[PDB]
Motif scaffolding. Structure first.
Motif, mmCIF file in Angstrom:
data_model
loop_
_atom_site.group_PDB
_atom_site.id
_atom_site.type_symbol
_atom_site.label_atom_id
_atom_site.label_comp_id
_atom_site.label_asym_id
_atom_site.label_seq_id
_atom_site.Cartn_x
_atom_site.Cartn_y
_atom_site.Cartn_z
ATOM 1 N N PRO C 22 0.848 -1.200 0.000
ATOM 2 C CA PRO C 22 0.000 0.000 0.000
ATOM 3 C C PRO C 22 0.872 1.234 0.000
ATOM 4 C CG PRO C 22 -0.674 -1.500 1.752
ATOM 5 C CD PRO C 22 0.727 -1.828 1.386
ATOM 6 N N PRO C 24 0.702 4.079 1.882
ATOM 7 C CA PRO C 24 1.201 4.610 3.166
ATOM 8 C C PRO C 24 2.327 3.792 3.794
ATOM 9 C CG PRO C 24 -0.900 3.542 3.544
ATOM 10 C CD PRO C 24 -0.775 3.725 2.069
ATOM 11 N N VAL C 25 2.232 2.470 3.760
ATOM 12 C CA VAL C 25 3.274 1.610 4.312
ATOM 13 C C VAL C 25 4.556 1.801 3.522
ATOM 14 C CG1 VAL C 25 1.632 -0.109 5.081
ATOM 15 C CG2 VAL C 25 2.662 -0.286 2.811
ATOM 16 N N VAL C 63 7.220 7.580 21.432
ATOM 17 C CA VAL C 63 6.023 7.747 20.588
ATOM 18 C C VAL C 63 4.926 8.557 21.293
ATOM 19 C CG1 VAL C 63 4.091 6.498 19.468
ATOM 20 C CG2 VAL C 63 6.443 5.715 19.133
ATOM 21 N N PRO C 85 6.189 -3.577 14.858
ATOM 22 C CA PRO C 85 4.794 -3.423 14.454
ATOM 23 C C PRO C 85 4.760 -2.087 13.735
ATOM 24 C CG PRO C 85 5.049 -2.870 16.793
ATOM 25 C CD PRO C 85 6.364 -2.704 16.096
ATOM 26 N N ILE C 86 4.391 -2.090 12.464
ATOM 27 C CA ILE C 86 4.369 -0.861 11.683
ATOM 28 C C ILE C 86 3.233 0.071 12.047
ATOM 29 C CG2 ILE C 86 2.981 -1.476 9.666
ATOM 30 C CD1 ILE C 86 5.924 -0.322 8.336
ATOM 31 N N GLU C 87 2.263 -0.452 12.779
ATOM 32 C CA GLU C 87 1.088 0.305 13.169
ATOM 33 C C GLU C 87 1.413 1.521 14.017
ATOM 34 O OE1 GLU C 87 2.063 -2.312 12.935
ATOM 35 O OE2 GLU C 87 0.711 -4.044 12.997
ATOM 36 N N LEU C 88 2.421 1.409 14.869
ATOM 37 C CA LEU C 88 2.777 2.502 15.763
ATOM 38 C C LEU C 88 3.193 3.815 15.104
ATOM 39 C CD1 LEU C 88 5.090 0.339 18.032
ATOM 40 C CD2 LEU C 88 2.689 -0.001 17.453
ATOM 41 N N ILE C 90 2.871 4.652 11.540
ATOM 42 C CA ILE C 90 2.330 4.926 10.206
ATOM 43 C C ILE C 90 1.787 6.329 10.046
ATOM 44 C CG2 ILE C 90 0.687 4.238 8.444
ATOM 45 C CD1 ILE C 90 0.294 1.649 9.840
ATOM 46 N N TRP C 91 1.135 6.799 11.092
ATOM 47 C CA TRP C 91 0.492 8.105 11.131
ATOM 48 C C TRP C 91 1.400 9.272 11.526
ATOM 49 C CZ3 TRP C 91 1.160 9.058 16.138
ATOM 50 C CH2 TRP C 91 1.265 7.953 16.975
#
Lengths: 61, 202, 174, 125, 73, 50
Positions: C22, C24-25, C63, C85-88, C90-91
């Motif tokens: 995707p 964003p990733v 973070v 974990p890429i979730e942390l 991304i934003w």
RNA sequence: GUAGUCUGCCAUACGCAGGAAGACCCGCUGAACUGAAGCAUCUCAUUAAGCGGAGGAAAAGAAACUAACUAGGAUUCCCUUAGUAAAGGCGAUCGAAAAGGGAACAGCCCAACGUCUUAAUCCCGAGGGAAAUGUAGUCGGUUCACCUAUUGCACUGGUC
RNA sequence: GGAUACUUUGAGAGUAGUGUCUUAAGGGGGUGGUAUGUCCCAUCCAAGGCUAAAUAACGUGAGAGACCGAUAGAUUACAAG
RNA sequence: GUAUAGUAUUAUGCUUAC
RNA sequence: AUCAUGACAGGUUAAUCUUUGAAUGCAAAUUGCGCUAAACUCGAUCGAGAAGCAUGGGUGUGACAGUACUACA
């Protein structure tokens, strides 16, 4: 008993004693944690217990 | 703060960014064994909701439960007695799959107290769940007023007796009101109603 | 031959290249170059946080604390470890795009560890800066804005997708 | 079924005879209760054993609007009107209930006067 | 006062929504609104989301998204 | 037999030293009468099943 | 090549798990005899046996609760409501709850979120380790009122 | 939460649980025992955790009786599992 | 999941899922 | 053994605690087949006995594996 009283004095007042020289007790009572840890107060709870302790009171006749 | 955004990202699982990330993880999980340890939890925010706090003694374990319902146990698919009870395949388990996840992880790991579990991933075949565990003998958990309730011997294997958050769902202990009146325990309540009572004066 | 975990490491690296990633990733993949990235650390190096026993009796380094600086609008610039974990993280880019904060996306999480004095870090930001420096800082803020000018034009409708092998390419041209 | 008796209604088709509960405990149960509350009132001393103090409260439905009973605890509004500290008033021997807020003006005037009679002759050791 | 008045959480709902984008059933619903089949589109949402009052909220959201594209296009 | 194991042989020992009449002096001590040794047997009549 | 990290596996130091018992307790699984004068839904029964797991008690428990009032206010149990509202080849049978009276009565705190606190936290016993992928702490400020010490657990034999 | 399937309930156009697929909102949502939309009024804020007392007791261990009195009473008053 | 021809769906390639 | 240097069928606690059994060095219808830095104790540097050595998981400590990530060469 001449051995044990002498040999306990060597390992007494020191961390992690031998298995022979530990006291007998039950299984349940060893694994039950010491009552200081169960009963210890949170920093919120202790600070309010400054004021909100279980105080004595009475009524007039 | 930061874990506003992790929450609101994880709401939208069905989307091209999130569905990509979950497939890569679910690929890795299929190659590895069923019950396996992690160093740190895949979902940090969701872990702390359910009671994880990152200190010594607190341990995390992924586990894999098979999707679909569980069939009845019969020898050569034979059924007997009254024909109302002749099914094999349309059974469902009364336990949730989260409960069966925890209850497998409980059987593999005794000496270790389940705090709670939560969902991580799924595919066609399997769900995946990430169970929090505690070593209650460890000094960091033996100390600390907030957590050390676990160290008491009443809480030995909660997952067996259904006292987890997932455990309380199947038992129907998640609601208050008219619907939930009958179920102290579903059974305990039934017994009170059915005991035959003979008072001493009659 | 290769003890499964070695085989997983390599397959995981190749499988990320082969799939349509995707955008964003994918944006995480682009990173500061080793010309500019060495210079940036000096500012960080100068502002390295204190260790224990070097205590007597500067830098925002996590973070949760970095998002406090970004949402306050106190942060001069942010640094993000390239891999976690890429979730942390991304934003981190979506915030700093919105509120007009400049930001690096620096390679290695571990070296952001080393400069702070832990094993990992994943997130650094600078609030106040120093009167003594500042001048050095401007050059770096200009270098990040001018350097990443190439990327964020491309990246918003970019898919770092299927690389499609060598032996697959030979079979197609048959 | 025979004769002129009423339809045979006995709920005795389950195996009730396994699930029997005889109450020969009752007078021994009375003493286990009674010896507890004496071993209370010695330990509670010098504080009054019939307490803690509880509010007067009207019962809900149409056929008990007449009657008035003991509630659970006083409101944080009713304590502050009477002259008390809501949190600390638990340990002065007054039960407190944060939830109740349908009590209208008439029953507040009772429960303020109820607490004032307590606070008039409460004293501290 | 003691109310939330959600600025900071609702700011986080914007930038995640911009980053992630729309979910499969919302794209399918937006296509039906482009074709001018609003009545069939609300039947599609009612099956997915479940109830009537859930579905009619999402239309009033998704109609505003398509009418933003009218000014752009 | 032959070719008995040792723990088989241990049982056959205990089965034959236990096989005897009851002593005379217990009847003199306790004054009870009519106590028989329970683990008496005969080899031909009752088999051990061990 | 070396220097950090990430992941995996092996070895070792120190305490932990297993087995017994199972009347009561908690979670699953689950019959038929029987009754319906037959029998298939229904009933016996969300019972017996089976599998898994606790404690001296367990489980429950601090409102997404009742109610429609002249209003109640966590959970548990006893009396009554009630053989009623309801369920049911509306056959056999089955069958609750609020209110009312009584026993007892005790409330608390993580998450995030205070867009603050120089990890201010914890384990090990001069210093090592965990932890920033997050431990610890009262939302900030003015101003009057007021409270000041006890509370759990533990308690022994002999003589006449 | 919804549709559907099974088990379950006094709960009846579903009381509760579970499988499958589907899947919210957060100046908003749940409940008010007839499905469905709709307008008022009332009452609470789910999806995380701990918590004594009243209560249970066909197991095991250690005073009372309008009970039995050796074919009874426990299988066993005794060298009885 | 994906790339390309044609009538949201049919056709035959791709491999990294399986 | 008696006005005690205290009889023994008394009651506790602590020692000693055979072969087994969750049974746990590997097995078992076998008194089968192992292993060990010091210390311990007999045995005259080197044998023996005594006492150790299980699986699973926790925290710490160490070591190895990797074309996994990265910097400096």
């Amino acid at each position: 008993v001449s051995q044990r009283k002498a040999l306990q004095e060597k390992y007494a007042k020191a961390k992690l004693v031998p298995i022979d020289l530990r006291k007998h007790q039950e299984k349940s009572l060893r694994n039950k944690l010491a009552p200081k840890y169960a009963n210890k107060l949170t920093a919120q709870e202790s600070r309010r217990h400054k004021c909100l302790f279980e105080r004595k009171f009475a009524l007039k006749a | 703060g930061a874990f506003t955004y992790l929450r609101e990202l994880y709401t939208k699982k069905q989307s091209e960014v999130m569905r990509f990330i979950l497939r890569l993880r679910c690929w890795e999980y299929r190659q590895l064994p069923e019950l396996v340890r992690l160093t740190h939890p895949s979902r940090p925010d969701k872990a702390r909701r359910m009671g994880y706090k990152a200190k010594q003694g607190m341990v995390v374990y992924r586990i894999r439960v098979r999707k679909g319902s569980r069939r009845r146990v019969a020898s050569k698919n034979r059924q007997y007695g009254k024909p109302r009870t002749h099914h094999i395949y349309k059974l469902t388990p009364s336990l949730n799959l989260q409960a069966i996840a925890e209850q497998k992880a409980g059987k593999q790991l005794p000496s270790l107290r389940l705090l709670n579990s939560y969902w991580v991933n799924q595919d066609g075949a399997f769900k995946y769940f990430e169970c929090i565990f505690v070593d209650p003998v460890h000094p960091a958990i033996q100390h600390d007023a907030k957590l050390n309730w676990i160290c008491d011997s009443v809480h030995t294997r909660r997952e067996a007796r259904g006292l987890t958050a997932a455990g309380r769902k199947h038992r129907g202990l998640s609601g208050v009101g008219h619907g939930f009146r009958h179920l102290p325990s579903r059974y305990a309540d039934w017994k009170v109603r059915n005991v035959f009572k003979l008072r001493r004066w009659r | 031959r290769f003890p499964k975990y070695v085989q997983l490491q390599r397959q995981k690296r190749i499988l990320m290249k082969r799939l349509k990633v995707p955008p964003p990733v994918n944006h995480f993949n682009h990173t500061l170059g080793k010309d500019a990235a060495v210079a940036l650390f000096k500012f960080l190096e100068k502002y390295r946080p204190e260790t224990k026993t070097e205590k007597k009796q500067a830098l925002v380094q996590g973070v949760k604390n970095v998002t406090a600086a970004i949402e306050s609008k106190k942060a001069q610039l942010v640094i993000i470890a390239h891999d976690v974990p890429i979730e942390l993280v991304i934003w981190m880019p979506a915030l700093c795009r919105n509120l007009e904060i400049p930001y690096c996306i620096v390679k290695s999480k571990s070296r952001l560890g080393q400069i702070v004095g832990m094993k990992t870090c994943s997130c650094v930001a600078l609030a106040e800066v120093k009167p003594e420096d500042r001048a050095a800082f401007t050059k770096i803020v200009d270098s990040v804005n001018s350097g990443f000018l190439a990327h964020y034009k491309e990246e918003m409708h970019q898919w770092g997708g299927g690389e499609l092998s060598e032996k697959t390419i030979e079979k197609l041209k048959a | 079924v025979a004769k002129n008796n009423q339809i045979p209604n006995d709920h005795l088709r389950k195996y009730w005879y396994h699930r029997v509960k005889t109450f020969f405990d009752d007078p021994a149960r009375a003493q286990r209760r009674r010896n507890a509350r004496n071993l209370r009132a010695k330990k509670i001393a010098p504080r009054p054993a019939e307490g803690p103090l509880r509010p007067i409260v009207r019962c809900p439905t149409v056929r008990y609007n007449m009657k008035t009973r003991l509630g659970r605890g006083f409101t944080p509004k009713e304590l502050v009107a009477a002259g008390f500290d809501p949190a600390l008033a638990r340990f002065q021997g007054i039960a407190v209930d944060a939830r109740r807020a349908h009590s209208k003006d008439a029953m507040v005037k009772q429960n303020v006067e109820r607490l004032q009679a307590y606070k008039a002759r409460l004293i501290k050791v | 006062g003691l109310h939330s008045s959600g600025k900071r959480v609702n700011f986080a709902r914007k930038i995640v929504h911009e980053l992630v984008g729309w979910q499969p059933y919302e794209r399918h619903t937006m296509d039906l609104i482009k074709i001018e089949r609003r009545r069939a589109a609300r039947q599609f949402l009612k099956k997915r989301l479940g109830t009537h009052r859930r579905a009619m909220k999402k239309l009033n959201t998704l109609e505003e998204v398509v009418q933003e594209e009218s000014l752009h296009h | 037999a032959a070719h008995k194991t040792l723990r088989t042989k241990r049982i056959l020992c205990k089965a034959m030293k236990v096989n005897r009449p009851m002593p005379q002096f217990i009847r003199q001590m306790t004054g009870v009468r009519h106590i028989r040794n329970p683990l008496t047997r005969h080899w031909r009549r009752r088999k051990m099943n061990i």
